[PDB]
Design a binder for this molecule. Structure first.
Ligand SMILES: [Zn+2]
Lengths: 48, 998, 59, 48, 116
RNA sequence: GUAAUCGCA
DNA sequence: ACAACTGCGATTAC
DNA sequence: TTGT
């Protein structure tokens, strides 16, 4: 049996409250859904 | 029989030394013990040496390390005491004492501490024949004889024959007189010696003649003698011969001896030290037996043998040896590599050896004899440079105390192949060629030429004349240097730096193997001792985190694992199961993986994407810019465990009492304490909290507090009641906190090629430069270090790593791959990159225009960079030195009792020191007031310092101190204790009056 | 072109458990206590106890 | 590129409460993984 | 061998030992391996035979014969080359299976389980 | 508070 | 008889 | 030790 708290934020969260209510451990979370991205720009060959 | 077809065990040296010790040294020492007979009736006690039997330890190693007890064996020998009145000898077995036992890894457990015995290199006894040129005239020739104790029976020759010994402090001594005293009748002397015309024309004792077996052999070698090995004494024939050679040197018929040659040196192992310690313990035992016999005679009682002997001498001797000897050091357990590299050290400095200052320059350089036997790139940086070195991988210690190396014999014979551990002096008279044979010039292959070694020289000869060949790749290096991939492309100077920096790595929370490696990590992790290797074949019936059950041949064996332990250097030790339930394991395979080891190979770092370019100055000098991915993904997270202990020392007036309820303390603290005065497990603590609370009546509050920087969970606490000290001893309470440390600005990172840096900025992934793939680089390094420190193998590594990551391959490459062809490393690297580019169609990985270089973009603006950059995935390690450990700051807290200056050390919360080289700079700048303030009220002036806090809190101006500091006053007091006065005596220019300042 | 020395020698599987019973590894390291006991260098506590009991019974 | 990486937010587990564990660096009987390993596993739980 | 376990579990028997084993009665399958120190492939075969002996602790007997010491016996057994394995069944009416070359360990297991 | 030993740059 | 880099930090042993 |  374990309890979980779910939160919605952005970026990465540092587990600042290490000293807190007993029995609950805070885990740092990364709220970045996109893993990687890339773009490329090719010409169209339209003259002027 | 072993080590001639594979790499030998790294800990085999200590193993065989301890084995030879237990086999022969104990009996040899017990043989030389004298018969105790000190009385008129001559009551004689004897120890039957034949009945020598060691007994297994009563406790285990896991109990000795836990209870801080020594791991030793019981020596029981039957003894017979013949009483004077009884006229008979009663025979009983007595417990002489404890003898420490060595683990399979080479370490010993004494008082719960892991300690290793470093070997020592000492000059062998023998005759040496040095020469020295005089200021005016012919060169003086001298011959020195060296004994085991260290005697120096020198012999010298002047412009004339003048065979004069330098034993006496006086001008000289007659060699003929010494020979006549030896027993020569002045006729057989001239009859036996060669060139008798020169001898005839010219017109304490036990230690000098205490030549060892080794000494005897050497004497025989240099001076051809047929004296049997057994007669280990300085015979006069040896002296006569010595004289003959000496005179012969004057006429050119001789060769001087090199005292830096290995053949002239001996190696002392753990056996040699333990034998001497056992001899000293036996001497103490004989003294104690004589004393107790004298006492029993005074008390008119004939006692049993057990009453005479006490277990004190052996135990106290071995304890003092392991505690205070300069060749017994605590094992370094920062990482598995340190445990193995610590036991391979050979040291010149030590008891009976050259001190740092004493050592001449010649001593500290490589001698051609060191090839294959000693590491030429592993030394200790500092004042002891060239005095502390490691031991080659394939070396062994010989029967005669000489390091031996394995040489293949290419000479044709019945077997046609041999692997012989030739000693240092023997390999000199052989043509040893390290080159290959892949050359044909329209003639027979044996007519080809190859570089070779002969008579401590280098030359080129035909393949017909080469007797030996050095085939082993890791023969000339050590464990530290051999773990450097592409070492040929790196400078020899940076190799020492890389070997030293590999030792500093911190075991991380997670471990990953290296894509590029040398293939020695496997045996390194095998012999490190932090791995679970089965000692029996069978099947794993039960798998658990704490223990593993192995069922074989109808027997079940339980192996206990290590779960978050603590090392000597505040590094966590943990083990994880590798084999699943229901598979068979042989005797020797890996059951579990320890810290800094994954899949059975040493893993001291991670593989991260790296680009070599300058980025906005953040890479100036050496400095690294890293991304936040290493932070929020726990790539370089590590666990560090520090212990704090305070003993409950019982004073004569009152014992210490441990209570939780202690007044005069705030309610914010003491929350973690239990009913008893100790912190609870699983409690988060910080700086300034109370871990153990004590009343300390003698009341007061000698408690345990946390220092600056200590913020970790309390994993475990131990109440250790101390016993065995012949009386009630204080209890010991040891707390352990675990601090999880992430990668931060100020941490040091390094690469296996000698590249070291300190993190300077943690940029986000969006600002980091990205490749054409779209992935941001994890680190950015400065490209100007390569021409500076001459590290080219790093480029190779990076590229091969990128290739491997893409193709999912790991490369274990032996060093010096250019023995096959030219540019073998370049061909391999470019071939693997092309394949990666073709298989995963990323054209960027191999650019035909610039192989190994790609064109990346800027994360900030999105514009491509002008020139291509190197993209790779090297192996980066995180070093032990960390910013948190190095941070320090003092305002005004504590002072020394006598000096009254601020205290020293970071743990003691002390300030920084203004030395003489900084006072000089301050005086050159002209800042007199700053120097005066630092020299008086920030350091030593008690009154001024007391007033400084008040003046700063109120805000008033701080007056200039006029009184002398406590340092000057101390001097005056000291000098006046030395009957010397000192008075300031300032004179006023206004009224011409003298005023004394006290 | 292709290297003379085969690359397959350097290639190694990433998730591979190193078998220490291969041809390139030495013999397994024997535990010091068991190695000394098997050769008779160190006796067990039972043998010493039996010897002491026999010596006491003889006396 | 700068929007997809750093300007998109998500949801993740931020706090875990365990029943009868002394600390997060210990082992519980009946589970092959320690508390820290369980926290690391829960850290990689993707939610929407 | 009480304190330290033996590293290798396959014993080198002679030709007379094999003749006595075949002539006598057996309750477990028998595996005969011909090897020579010189053959390279045999170095691997020996490792797989060690693994098989560990997997079959007392349900099968595994022995090895050196061809250098017994060449005539190996020639009489119709042994063409070195990586050869002889599988002797326990019941003496069934036919022995001879395998040549390096074969996977699973093949050996299946042969011992079904064919023998 | 002193030593020993190692490291650091 | 005298002196031979500067400091810092860690450990164990008294 | 190395030299003073
Ligand atoms: Zn190379």
């Amino acid at each position: 049996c374990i309890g979980l708290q779910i939160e919605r934020n952005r970026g990465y969260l540092i587990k600042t409250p290490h000293n807190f209510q007993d029995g609950s451990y805070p885990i740092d979370a990364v709220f970045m859904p996109v893993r990687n991205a890339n773009h490329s720009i090719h010409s169209y060959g339209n003259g002027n | 029989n072993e080590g001639i077809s594979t790499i030998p065990g790294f800990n085999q040296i200590q193993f065989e030394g301890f084995c030879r010790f237990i086999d022969q040294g104990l009996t040899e020492e017990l043989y030389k013990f004298p018969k105790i007979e000190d009385t008129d009736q001559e009551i004689e006690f004897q120890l039957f040496v034949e009945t020598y039997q060691l007994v297994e330890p009563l406790i285990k190693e896991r109990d000795a390390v836990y209870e801080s007890l020594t791991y030793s064996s019981e020596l029981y020998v039957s003894a017979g005491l013949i009483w004077k009145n009884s006229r008979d000898m009663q025979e009983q077995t007595i417990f002489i004492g404890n003898i420490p036992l060595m683990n399979s890894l080479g370490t010993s457990i004494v008082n719960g501490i892991y300690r290793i015995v470093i070997n020592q290199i000492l000059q062998s006894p023998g005759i040496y024949y040095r020469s020295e040129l005089d200021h005016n005239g012919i060169s003086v020739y001298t011959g020195t004889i060296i004994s085991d104790w260290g005697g120096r029976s020198e012999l010298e020759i002047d412009r004339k024959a003048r065979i004069w010994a330098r034993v006496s402090r006086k001008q000289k001594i007659s060699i003929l007189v010494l020979s006549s005293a030896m027993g020569l009748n002045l006729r057989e002397i001239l009859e036996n010696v060669c060139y008798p015309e020169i001898f005839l024309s010219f017109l304490f004792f036990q230690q000098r003649c205490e030549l060892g077996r080794i000494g005897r052999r050497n004497m025989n070698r240099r001076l051809n003698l047929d004296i049997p090995q057994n007669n280990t004494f300085l015979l006069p024939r040896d002296i006569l011969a010595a004289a003959d050679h000496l005179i012969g040197l004057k006429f050119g018929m001789g060769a001087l001896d090199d005292m830096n040659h290995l053949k002239n040196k001996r190696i002392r192992s753990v056996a040699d030290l333990l034998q001497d310690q056992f001899g000293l313990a036996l001497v103490r035992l004989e003294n104690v037996v004589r004393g107790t016999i004298c006492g029993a005679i005074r008390h008119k009682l004939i006692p049993t043998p057990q009453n005479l002997v006490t277990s004190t001498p052996l135990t106290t001797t071995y304890e003092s040896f392991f505690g205070l000897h300069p060749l017994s050091q605590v094992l370094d357990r920062t990482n598995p590599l340190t445990q193995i590299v610590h036991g391979r050290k050979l040291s010149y400095l030590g008891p009976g050896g050259l001190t740092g200052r004493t050592a001449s320059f010649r001593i500290r350089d490589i001698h051609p004899s060191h090839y294959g036997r000693i590491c030429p790139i592993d030394t200790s940086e500092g004042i002891n440079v060239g005095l502390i070195g490691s031991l080659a991988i394939h070396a062994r210690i010989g029967h005669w105390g000489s390091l031996e190396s394995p040489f293949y014999e290419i000479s044709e014979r019945s077997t046609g192949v041999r692997m012989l551990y030739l000693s240092p002096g023997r390999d000199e008279y052989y043509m040893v060629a390290a080159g290959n044979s892949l050359a044909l010039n329209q003639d027979i292959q044996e007519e080809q030429v190859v570089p070779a070694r002969y008579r401590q020289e280098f030359l080129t000869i035909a393949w017909e004349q080469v007797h030996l060949r050095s085939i082993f790749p890791f023969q000339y290096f050590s464990i530290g240097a051999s773990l450097i991939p592409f070492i040929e492309h790196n400078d020899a100077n940076r190799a020492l730096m890389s070997s030293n920096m590999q030792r500093q790595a911190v075991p991380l929370s997670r471990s990953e193997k290296c894509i590029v490696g040398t293939g020695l990590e496997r045996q390194a992790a095998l012999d490190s001792g932090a791995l679970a290797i089965a000692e029996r074949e069978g099947r794993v019936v039960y798998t658990n985190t704490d223990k593993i059950l192995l069922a074989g041949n109808g027997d079940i064996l339980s192996i206990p694992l290590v779960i978050y332990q603590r090392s000597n250097k505040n590094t966590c030790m943990h083990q994880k199961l590798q084999v699943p339930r229901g598979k068979c394991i042989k005797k020797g395979q890996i059951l579990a993986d320890g810290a800094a080891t994954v899949g059975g190979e040493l893993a001291l770092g991670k593989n991260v994407l790296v680009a070599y370019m300058p980025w906005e100055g953040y890479n100036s000098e050496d400095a690294v810019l890293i991304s936040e991915r290493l932070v929020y993904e726990d790539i370089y997270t590590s666990f560090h465990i520090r212990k704090y202990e305070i003993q409950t020392h019982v004073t004569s007036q009152g014992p210490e009492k441990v209570t939780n309820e202690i007044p005069h303390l705030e309610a914010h603290l003491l929350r973690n304490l239990d009913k008893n005065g100790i912190v609870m497990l699983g409690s988060w603590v910080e700086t300034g909290d109370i871990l153990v609370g004590k009343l300390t009546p003698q009341s007061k509050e000698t408690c345990l507090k946390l220092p600056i920087g200590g913020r970790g969970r309390v994993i475990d606490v131990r109440w250790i009641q101390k016993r065995g000290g012949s009386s009630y001893n204080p209890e010991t309470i040891r707390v352990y906190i675990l601090q999880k440390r992430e990668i931060k600005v100020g941490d040091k990172v390094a690469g296996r090629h000698g590249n070291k840096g300190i993190i300077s900025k943690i940029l986000p992934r969006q600002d980091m430069p990205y490749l054409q793939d779209g992935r941001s680089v994890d680190m950015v390094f400065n490209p100007l270090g390569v021409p500076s420190r001459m590290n080219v193998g790093q480029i190779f590594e990076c590229s091969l790593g990128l290739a491997g990551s893409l193709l999912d391959r790991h490369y274990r490459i032996a060093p010096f791959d250019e023995r096959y062809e030219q540019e073998a490393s370049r061909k391999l690297v470019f071939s693997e990159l092309y394949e990666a580019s073709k298989q995963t169609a990323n054209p960027w990985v191999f650019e035909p225009e610039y192989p190994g270089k790609s064109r990346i973009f800027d994360g900030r603006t999105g514009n491509p960079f002008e020139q291509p950059v190197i993209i790779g995935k090297p192996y980066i390690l995180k070093l032990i030195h960390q910013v948190d450990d190095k941070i320090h700051g003092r305002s005004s807290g504590h002072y020394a009792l006598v000096t009254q200056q601020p205290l020293r050390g970071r743990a003691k919360q002390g300030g920084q020191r203004v030395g003489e080289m900084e006072v000089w700079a301050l005086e050159g700048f002209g800042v007199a007031h700053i120097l005066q303030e630092m020299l008086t009220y920030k350091s030593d002036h008690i009154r001024a310092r007391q007033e400084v806090l008040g003046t700063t809190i109120i805000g008033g101006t701080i007056p200039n101190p006029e009184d002398a500091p406590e340092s000057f006053r101390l001097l005056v007091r000291e000098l006046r204790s030395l009957a010397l006065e000192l008075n300031h005596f300032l004179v006023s220019e206004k009224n011409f009056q003298i005023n004394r300042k006290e | 072109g292709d290297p003379v020395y085969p690359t397959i020698n350097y290639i190694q599987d990433p998730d591979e458990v190193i078998d220490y019973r291969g041809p390139d590894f030495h013999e397994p390291t024997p535990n010091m206590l068991a190695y000394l006991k098997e050769h008779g260098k160190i006796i067990s506590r039972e043998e010493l106890e039996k010897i002491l009991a026999k010596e006491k019974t003889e006396e | 590129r700068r929007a997809l990486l750093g300007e998109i937010e998500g949801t993740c587990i931020t706090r875990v409460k365990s029943e009868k564990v002394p600390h997060e660096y210990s082992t519980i009987t009946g589970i092959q993984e320690s508390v820290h390993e369980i926290l690391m596993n829960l850290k990689e739980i993707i939610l929407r | 061998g009480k304190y330290v376990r033996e590293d290798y579990l396959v014993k080198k028997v002679s030709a007379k030992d094999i003749q006595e084993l075949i002539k006598g009665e057996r309750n477990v399958p028998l595996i005969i391996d011909f090897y020579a120190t010189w053959c390279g492939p045999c170095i691997l075969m020996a490792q797989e035979l060690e693994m098989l002996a560990v997997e079959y602790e007392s349900n099968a007997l595994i022995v090895k014969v050196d061809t250098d010491d017994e060449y005539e016996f190996a020639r009489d057994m119709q042994v063409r080359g070195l990586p050869t394995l002889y599988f002797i069944s326990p019941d003496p009416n069934k036919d022995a299976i001879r395998t040549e070359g390096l074969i996977p360990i699973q093949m050996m297991r299946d042969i011992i389980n079904n064919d023998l």
